[PDB]
Write a protein that binds this ligand. Structure first.
Ligand SMILES: CCCCCCCCCCCCCCCCCC(=O)OC[C@H](CO[C@@H]1O[C@H](CO[C@H]2O[C@H](CO)[C@H](O)[C@H](O)[C@H]2O)[C@H](O)[C@H](O)[C@H]1O)OC(=O)CCCCCCCCCCCCCCCCC
Ligand code: CL7
Ligand code: CL7
Ligand code: CL7
Ligand code: CL7
Ligand code: CL7
Ligand code: CL7
Ligand SMILES: CCCCCCCCCCCCCCCCCC(=O)OC[C@H](CO[C@@H]1O[C@H](CO)[C@H](O)[C@H](O)[C@H]1O)OC(=O)CCCCCCCCCCCCCCCCC
Ligand SMILES: CC1=C(/C=C/C(C)=C/C=C/C(C)=C/C=C/C=C(C)/C=C/C=C(C)/C=C/C2=C[C@H](C)[C@H](O)CC2(C)C)C(C)(C)C[C@@H](O)C1
Ligand SMILES: CC1=C(/C=C/C(C)=C/C=C/C(C)=C/C=C/C=C(C)/C=C/C=C(C)/C=C/C2=C[C@H](C)[C@H](O)CC2(C)C)C(C)(C)C[C@@H](O)C1
Ligand SMILES: CC1=C(/C=C/C(C)=C/C=C/C(C)=C/C=C/C=C(C)/C=C/C=C(C)/C=C/C2=C[C@H](C)[C@H](O)CC2(C)C)C(C)(C)C[C@@H](O)C1
Ligand SMILES: [Fe+2]
Lengths: 349, 420, 329, 284
């Protein structure tokens, strides 16, 4: 944590989650529980949406976030975005619920298994997992393994799109997609030269090639981080503390949330119109909005509207939380703000 | 005997029960005996009204109120508010009388035979008023029992016979509710409805689905709240914002009961759904509108409406004060903007035309069950408000210490700076 | 020491072991007792003319599926078989009550033959007990298989009872010609039941024969205990209940539409449930709906109880919970 | 000395000229609103369609009336029990025409009265005395709530409420007598006994004390209790009559042996009620 100066700080229950920042086993338990919550949301919401699905109503008119996402990636969608068979959605949600139960069981296991600290546990092999908030070598290996998992996921997406096929609004029906590979076109999407704009990708072939590239990059980076200790300059720049790593991750997540929010409202290929609804338009009054570009009269809002706005707010407040945690981890205590209207300088490290 | 005199307690005979404040066992006996009294009255009155029941006359003409409560729940009734057999009423009355016998036995046993102060016998049953945790837990247990009761009523309405729904087609009919309402928006719209004529606070419920869903919701909440009370302590601010003594708890209960009594009066006087007009007779609004419609029927047979302040079609005369009244026999002759004249020209089915006159005669010589219940419980509610004030003031003063008079030599008013 | 409301926790003591055994015997008697009693009342209230999925008959349809008074389908011709089965179960109940009372107060207070006597931390003892129970379970499965071979159960596609290939290794993969929850072949049911009986008997032989191994003693961190064993059993029960509820909701070959009513639709509000998809009268539900929903929610609360007992089995005490909420006021 | 604490010590302080207290926090705005609107609507206010028949009835000073005949007319018959806030009105002139000021006044006034009772209790507490002045004050409170709130509720509209005026009160009394025969209701007889006996006991007590001053505690207890109990009873009587549970009726009681009917005083009283009623009830 931070504990400006004085150690052994006392936290109220409102900020009570900072108590286990030093208990590696409990840290593991909390995060396994959180991942359980995420996958439980996926499965349970899939079923909750299936319960009230109307084939007559267009998919985006009714309030869904999961049926469009499943129908996009194959999974029982006919020609012209028609939900022919509604059983694969049930299967997907059920697998998600089973996974959630597994994760939650692991969470309780670790919360009650042994000592709070993973150094003391006499497993003699769980001690291989005890980490520190100062050592960058172990955290580099951890980063490498997690990048390996992400790259393996991108690879799985590439394979599933190659074999099972995937929906293509330009084609108009589920279709296998050849994995492209053109580093030149990847970099041209990087520059956003006039032909290629990253948020206006038109061919699923380009998307598939980019995903292949991402998988390769993530796997290579994972290997590299597992093998190689961080360089000294990365110790010079970054502080070594838990809240600092939370700040870095929060900044990254806020950026990714904003990117995904903009992606939803604009791209029509990777977010097909028949499932999510017509494209939005970005407005800026006091705060950014996404206008539905459609008469909300007797149609509510398209699912794309909800996804885009929710993730704009998620990204913005992840940025604000990143600022808060980076300010703390660098050394700034906000209590000094109370000295604003006095003659004492409102400033410290 | 000792402690049963004025000298040893300080209370005159006319305040004798006050002596029971700190005698746990006898106080419990008194409560149990009083509960026995209540259920004995219920059973005895049920048996009386059954013994004097007459199948041809309506309940409200016949003059029965405990029977109408059972009739609403559908015990031995049929479509159109017709009894089939008065046996289940006898069953209920007999069960209540037996329960009263058992409760009276328990009350006598704790009053005289059993321990006088449970604190001596045990500690779960030994309680002192100023133990905040113990009182919290007891309140929680009884809350759980209430929640079970509410869920029981919902379960009866959904699986066991149901309730007499007077919005079933062709007059009322006993129904089993299958689609309870559970949308929270509906619940908030009910709570935050204006208590004034601008709707009705909770008295304005008109379908039985909402009733059953509401009882489901409240039973769940009561069970949860009871568990919460058992499992937690009173917060610091809670400990500092109340008075902790027996009389204070009594005063709180009195206030709650006064509020409930007023609301019950409102229900029995303005509601025709959970108090079917087939049994309790027509409400005042229903009676006035039935009179207006019957006169209109006669005048249309031999060869009067108007515009609402909002411009709809309503009846004319005094009855305009009931322009928004909704009824089962009148609802089919509705329209987007008030009851259409064309509809009244040829849409009056025979049973509605019979109900109109049958209600016109029995306008609340003849006193409706609604009149009895409303008057009795308004008077009871007012007196319970008075009792709430009396006991709350006494509790506050006694906790402060100046209950038995002002102190001659340390009088507080004598120390304040004169305002002039 | 335990209070009266938690009185059965007293049986946890190895000081009074045999009495503990008595309780279990009694339970089974009660169970089989109900199997009689319920049926009798059902046989009283069962009209033959009406469809069998309207009135509160749960066991009668189960017997109807197992032949027992069905001809060309939708045929009830003898209610005496149901009464016979109920009477058999209820009479067995008296024997089981007798054994329960023999161990409760006549038999030894503690088993400490001694071959039956065991301890909560004797993995060989539990291994052989487990083997024997598995052998009996597989024996019952094979008995059902024999019943299929000889008597034969009702089939809807054939419209009548009939008697009777291991592609089970593909059903387990849920390949699109599979998802066993949609079985529609009597031969599939019979073959799978043969397989499960064989595997159960093999496992029972193995467990009697071989003691628990260290590799699997690693993972069983705390189950060698009363609370742990109870928790694992409860979790298994909940799993089975979920599977049975889904089978009842979806499958029609085993549960014919004649006696159970049409299939159920899985719906979800705040919590899951199963809707009729049948135009039954308002306030009435098919027997299939009752079975699926009650089974499922019993299994759900079995899962909750499994969590409770498992947590108590590991290092956790629930009575500490208010105290925690006391400190962080 | 937190700002909130300073505020609380200000309000719940026994050094103001008039005690405010938490109940007085509600009492003061509501009472001021009621008084202001009453004064304004009693001096000048348009005629009000009391009968809900597009025909108005005037009650203000600037429209011709004097103190004896002026009044604040009850809200219109068409409104019923509907609250009629200004912002819920079509037009200000219309809102006056339907009798909104009456609703405003009576609602603020009733809330202020109940808060005044609370304030009485609160100051009795703050001074250290037994807190039962409020119990005694609860009787006239019940009476006002009867005439202004409960009776219209039973009758379905505020048009049946009591007018706020000297002659309006008498008109209310006569219509009430016509429709419910209150005189022959025992609770009103208890109320009459209460007021007359209260005056009797007041005169006796005052004469005795002022003559000799040149259990005795139970004397003052009885003084306090008697009229209060009787006023509770008569307020309850009015409330019951608000639910059509009318008083005694002895019309057509004695009959001649052959079959004729011999009049008694009750028949004369009924005929007087008949006159009052037929003059009421504009149409039928
Ligand atoms: C903590 C404490 C908090 C206290 C907060 C107080 C907030 C304000 C309280 C206002 C009290 C009510 C004032 C009168 C409002 C009214 O128009 O009341 C009417 C309502 C019911 O409203 C009616 O409800 C009816 C419901 O009918 C509908 O539903 C029916 C169902 O059968 C039928 O279907 C019917 O046809 C259909 O139209 C209609 O909608 C009417 O339009 C509507 O006027 O009564 C009711 O709420 C019943 C309860 C109030 C009646 C008595 C109040 C007495 C108050 C205390 C006085 C004594 C004090 C002691 C000192 C002496
Ligand atoms: C009327 C206001 C009122 C209410 C509604 C009320 N109390 Mg009291 N009340 C108590 C309980 C109570 C409970 C449990 C309770 C709610 O159920 C109430 N109260 C309610 C006891 C703790 C405590 C002791 C009570 C005690 O010991 O004895 C009670 C005394 C008597 C004479 C009861 C006889 C009743 C009267 C003859 C009324 C007649 C009504 C009529 C029959 C109805 C039918 C019609 C008929 C004509 C056919 C108490 C008191 C007391 C008083 C007073 C003045 C009150 N109260 C007043 C109220 C004590 O001095 C006194 C007190 O506290 O002194 C310290
Ligand atoms: C709303 C902006 C915001 C974001 C998005 C954010 N935090 Mg916080 N945040 C934490 C985790 C966290 C995670 C894991 C996470 C991203 O996954 C975030 N946060 C994100 C806990 C370590 C810590 C306590 C958690 C807690 O209070 O629960 C925390 C705080 C805290 C705050 C505040 C004000 C925030 N935050 C704010 C944010 C503490 O005081 C408070 C704090 O540090 O008090 C000393
Ligand atoms: C399968 C259920 C479960 C899940 C969800 C889970 N674990 Mg384990 N798990 C670990 C990490 C872990 C991580 C990083 C992680 C999330 O990615 C999980 N786990 C998740 C290691 C710290 C630790 C070493 C085993 C190891 O292989 O690492 C571990 C164990 C262990 C076990 C067991 C039985 C589990 N688990 C179980 C789980 C040890 O006894 C065993 C143990 O040592 O108990 C003290
Ligand atoms: C006459 C006033 C009065 C009423 C109506 C009354 N009690 Mg008493 N009353 C009881 C019950 C009771 C019940 C269940 C009940 C309900 O109707 C009442 N009372 C009512 C018993 C628990 C208790 C024992 C008799 C009792 C008493 C007692 C007295 C006295 C003087 C009274 N009372 C008085 C009353 C004890 O000394 C005496 C007392 O409290 O000494 C400890
Ligand atoms: C308490 C003894 C008992 C048990 C444990 C029990 N039932 Mg019943 N039970 C049912 C299902 C059920 C299931 C699925 C089930 C176990 O999973 C049980 N029951 C179990 C429904 C098919 C049926 C109505 C559902 C119902 O409301 O129960 C039923 C009844 C009914 C009864 C009665 C008295 C019972 N029961 C009793 C039991 C009907 O009247 C009643 C009956 O016979 O209907 C005519
Ligand atoms: C409702 C969740 C639940 C289920 C599914 C469940 N139990 Mg319990 N349960 C027991 C057996 C049991 C069996 C054999 C069994 C499955 O057949 C179950 N349970 C199942 C007894 C060993 C034990 C005492 C029996 C008892 O308390 O009765 C028990 C308890 C207890 C609890 C609690 C809270 C539970 N339970 C709860 C459950 C004790 O207090 C209580 C406890 O141990 O703390 C005092
Ligand atoms: C002590 C233990 C405490 C445990 C928790 C609390 C238990 C007590 C309360 C249980 C009942 C709760 C009822 C909620 C109903 C509800 O929300 O309906 C409303 C919801 C939603 O219902 C509808 O769902 C459809 C979905 O498409 C609709 O479109 C709408 O969304 C919605 O109206 O109903 C459900 O989701 C069904 C849930 C059923 C759960 C049953 C649990 C029973 C548990 C046992 C209770 C005791 C039984 C004793 C028998 C003897
Ligand atoms: C600079 C610096 C710092 C900052 C360091 C930071 C935060 C640097 C920021 C780095 C960022 C923002 C990196 C972002 C990289 C983005 C990448 C690598 C994008 C990859 C996207 C791909 C591969 C898209 C792929 C496809 C996917 C999609 C289908 C498209 O249709 C087409 C297609 C196929 C191209 C500090 C502050 C930490 C320390 C300082 O002292 C130094
Ligand atoms: C590994 C691990 C553990 C978990 C261990 C567990 C709980 C593992 C879970 C094991 C399970 C759930 C096993 C389930 C096995 C299910 C089987 C074998 C099903 C058999 C079904 C058959 C054969 C059905 C047969 C038919 C029957 C039916 C008639 C059909 O019409 C036809 C047909 C053929 C499909 C712990 C608890 C030890 C510790 C954890 O931390 C990690
Ligand atoms: C025993 C014990 C305790 C614990 C006690 C507990 C917590 C007991 C728990 C009890 C529970 C929660 C039991 C749950 C029972 C579940 C039931 C009865 C299921 C009902 C489902 C029904 C009735 C069907 C509902 C439908 C009916 C119809 C078909 C609809 O279309 C759909 C559908 C399926 C929902 C304490 C706490 C008291 C003390 C401890 O020391 C020991
Ligand atoms: Fe005096």
């Amino acid at each position: 944590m931070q504990t400006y100066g004085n150690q052994n700080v006392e936290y109220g229950w409102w900020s009570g989650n900072s108590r286990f920042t030093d208990f590696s086993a409990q840290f593991l338990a909390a995060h396994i529980g959180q991942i359980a919550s995420m996958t439980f949301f996926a499965g349970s919401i899939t079923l909750f949406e299936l319960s009230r699905y109307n084939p007559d109503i267009p998919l985006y008119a009714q309030g869904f976030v999961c049926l469009p996402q499943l129908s996009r990636v194959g999974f029982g969608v006919g020609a012209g975005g028609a939900v022919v068979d509604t059983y694969p959605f049930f299967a997907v949600g059920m697998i998600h619920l089973f996974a959630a139960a597994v994760f939650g069981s692991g969470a309780i296991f670790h919360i009650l298994t042994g000592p709070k600290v993973l150094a003391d546990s006499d497993s003699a092999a769980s001690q291989r997992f005890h980490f520190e908030w100062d050592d960058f070598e172990t955290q580099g290996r951890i980063l490498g393994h997690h990048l390996l998992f992400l790259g393996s996921g991108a690879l799985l997406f590439v394979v599933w799109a190659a074999t099972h096929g995937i929906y293509d609004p330009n084609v108009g029906e589920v279709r296998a997609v050849s994995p492209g590979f053109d580093i030149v076109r990847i970099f041209k999407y990087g520059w956003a030269t006039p032909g290629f704009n990253p948020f206006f990708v038109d061919n699923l072939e380009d998307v598939m090639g980019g995903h292949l590239f991402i998988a390769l990059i993530d796997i290579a980076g994972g290997i590299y981080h597992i093998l190689v200790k961080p360089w000294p300059y990365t110790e010079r720049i970054f502080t070594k503390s838990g809240e600092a790593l939370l700040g870095y991750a929060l900044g990254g997540l806020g950026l990714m949330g904003l990117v995904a929010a903009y992606f939803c409202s604009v791209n029509d290929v990777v977010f097909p119109v028949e499932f999510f609804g017509p494209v939005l338009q970005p407005n800026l009054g006091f705060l950014p909005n996404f206008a539905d570009t459609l008469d909300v009269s007797a149609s509510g809002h398209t699912s794309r509207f909800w996804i885009a706005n929710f993730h704009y707010f998620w990204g913005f407040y992840c940025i604000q939380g990143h600022l808060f945690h980076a300010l703390r981890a660098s050394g700034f205590d906000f209590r000094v703000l109370t000295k604003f209207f006095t003659t004492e300088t409102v400033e410290l490290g | 005997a000792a402690g049963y005199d004025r000298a040893t307690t300080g209370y005159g005979w006319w305040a004798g029960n006050a002596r029971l404040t700190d005698l746990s066992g006898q106080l419990t006996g008194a409560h149990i005996a009083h509960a026995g009294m209540i259920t004995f009255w219920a059973g005895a009155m049920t048996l009386f009204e059954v013994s004097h029941f007459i199948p041809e006359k309506p309940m409200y003409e016949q003059g029965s109120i405990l029977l109408a409560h059972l009739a609403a729940e559908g015990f031995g009734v049929g479509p159109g508010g017709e009894v089939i057999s008065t046996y289940p009423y006898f069953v209920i009355g007999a069960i209540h009388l037996i329960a009263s016998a058992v409760l009276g036995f328990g009350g006598l046993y704790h009053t005289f035979r059993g321990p006088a102060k449970f604190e001596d016998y045990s500690d779960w049953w030994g309680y002192d008023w100023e133990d905040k945790e113990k009182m919290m837990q007891i309140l929680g247990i009884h809350l759980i029992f209430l929640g079970i009761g509410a869920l029981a009523f919902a379960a009866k309405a959904m699986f066991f016979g149901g309730l007499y729904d007077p919005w079933a087609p062709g007059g009322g009919n006993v129904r089993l509710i299958t689609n309870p309402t559970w949308n929270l928006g509906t619940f908030l719209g009910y709570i935050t409805r204006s208590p004034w004529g601008e709707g009705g606070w909770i008295v304005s419920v008109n379908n039985l689905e909402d009733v059953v869903g509401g009882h489901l919701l409240v039973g769940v909440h009561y069970i949860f709240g009871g568990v919460f009370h058992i499992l937690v302590k009173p917060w610091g601010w809670v400990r500092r914002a109340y008075v902790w003594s027996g009389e204070a708890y009594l005063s709180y209960s009195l206030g709650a009961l006064y509020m409930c009594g007023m609301i019950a009066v409102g229900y029995v006087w303005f509601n025709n759904t959970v108090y079917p007009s087939e049994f309790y007779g027509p409400t005042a609004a229903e009676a006035s509108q039935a009179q207006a419609m019957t006169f209109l029927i006669r005048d249309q047979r031999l060869g009067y409406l108007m515009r609402s302040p909002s411009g709809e079609i309503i009846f004319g005369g005094e009855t305009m004060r009931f322009w928004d009244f909704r009824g089962p026999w009148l609802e089919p002759l509705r329209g987007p903007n008030g009851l259409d004249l064309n509809k009244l020209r040829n849409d009056i089915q025979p049973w509605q035309a019979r109900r109109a006159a049958e209600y016109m005669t029995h306008a609340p010589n003849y006193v409706s069950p609604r009149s009895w219940l409303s008057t009795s419980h308004f008077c009871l509610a007012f007196f319970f408000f008075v009792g709430h004030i009396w006991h709350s003031g006494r509790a506050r003063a006694a906790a402060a210490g100046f209950e038995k008079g002002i102190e001659r030599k340390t009088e507080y008013a004598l120390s304040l700076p004169d305002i002039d | 020491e335990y209070p009266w409301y938690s009185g059965n926790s007293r049986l946890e003591d190895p000081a009074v072991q045999g009495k503990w055994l008595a309780a279990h015997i009694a339970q089974i008697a009660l169970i089989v007792f109900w199997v009689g009693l319920n049926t009798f009342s059902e046989n009283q209230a069962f009209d033959t003319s009406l469809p069998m999925f309207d009135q509160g008959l749960v066991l009668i349809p189960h017997l109807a599926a197992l032949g027992f008074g069905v001809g060309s389908g939708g045929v009830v011709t003898n209610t005496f078989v149901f009464t016979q089965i109920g009477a058999i179960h209820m009479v067995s109940s008296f024997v089981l009550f007798g054994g329960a009372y023999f161990h409760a107060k006549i038999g030894p207070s503690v088993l400490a033959t001694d071959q039956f006597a065991f301890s909560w931390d004797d993995p060989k003892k539990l291994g052989y007990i487990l083997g024997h129970h598995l052998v009996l379970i597989g024996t019952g499965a094979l008995l059902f298989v024999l019943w299929i071979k000889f008597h034969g159960i009702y089939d809807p596609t054939i419209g009548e009872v009939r008697t009777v290939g291991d592609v089970v290794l593909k059903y387990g993969w849920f390949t699109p010609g599979y998802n066993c929850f949609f079985v529609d072949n009597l031969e599939d049911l019979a073959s799978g039941h043969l397989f499960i009986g064989l595997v159960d008997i093999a496992g029972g032989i193995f467990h009697i024969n071989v003691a628990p191994l260290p590799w699997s003693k690693v993972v069983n961190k705390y189950t060698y205990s009363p609370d742990g064993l109870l928790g694992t059993a409860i979790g298994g029960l909940a799993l089975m209940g979920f599977i049975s509820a889904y089978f009842c909701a979806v499958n029609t070959l085993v549960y014919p539409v004649e006696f159970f009513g049409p299939a159920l639709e899985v719906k979800f509000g705040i919590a899951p449930y199963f809707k009729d998809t049948a135009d039954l009268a308002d306030g009435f539900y098919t027997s299939r709906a009752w079975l699926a929903n009650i089974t499922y929610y019993l299994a759900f609360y079995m899962l909750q109880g499994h969590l409770y007992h498992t947590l108590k089995a590991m290092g956790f005490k629930f009575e500490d919970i208010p105290a925690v909420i006391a400190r962080d006021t | 000395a937190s700002a909130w604490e300073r505020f609380c010590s200000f309000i719940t302080s026994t050094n103001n000229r008039l005690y405010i207290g938490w109940f007085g926090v509600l009492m003061i705005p509501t009472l001021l609103t009621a008084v202001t609107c009453f004064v304004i609507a009693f001096i000048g206010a348009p005629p009000v369609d009391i009968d809900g028949i597009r025909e108005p009835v005037a009650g203000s000073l600037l429209y011709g009336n004097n103190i004896i005949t002026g009044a604040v007319v009850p809200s219109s018959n068409a409104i019923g029990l509907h609250l009629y806030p200004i912002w819920e009105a079509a037009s200000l002139d219309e809102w006056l025409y339907n009798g909104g000021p009456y609703q405003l006044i009576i609602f603020h006034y009733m809330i202020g009265c109940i808060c005044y009772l609370g304030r009485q209790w609160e100051y009795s507490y703050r001074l250290g005395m037994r807190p039962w002045i409020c119990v005694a004050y609860s009787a006239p409170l019940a009476a006002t709530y009867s005439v202004f709130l409960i009776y219209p509720l039973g009758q379905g509209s505020f048009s049946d409420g009591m007018p706020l005026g000297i002659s309006g009160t008498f008109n209310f009394m006569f219509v009430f007598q016509a429709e419910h025969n209150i005189l022959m209701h025992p609770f009103h007889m208890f109320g009459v006994a209460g007021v007359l006996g209260g005056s009797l006991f007041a005169a006796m007590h005052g004469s005795l004390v002022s003559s000799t001053l040149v259990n005795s505690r139970s004397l003052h207890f009885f003084l306090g209790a008697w009229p209060v109990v009787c006023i509770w009873l008569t307020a309850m009587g009015i409330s019951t009559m608000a639910f059509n549970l009318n008083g005694f009726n002895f019309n057509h009681s004695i009959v001649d042996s052959q079959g004729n009917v011999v009049n008694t005083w009750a028949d004369v009283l009924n005929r007087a009620n008949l006159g009052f009623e037929v003059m009421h009830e504009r149409n039928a």
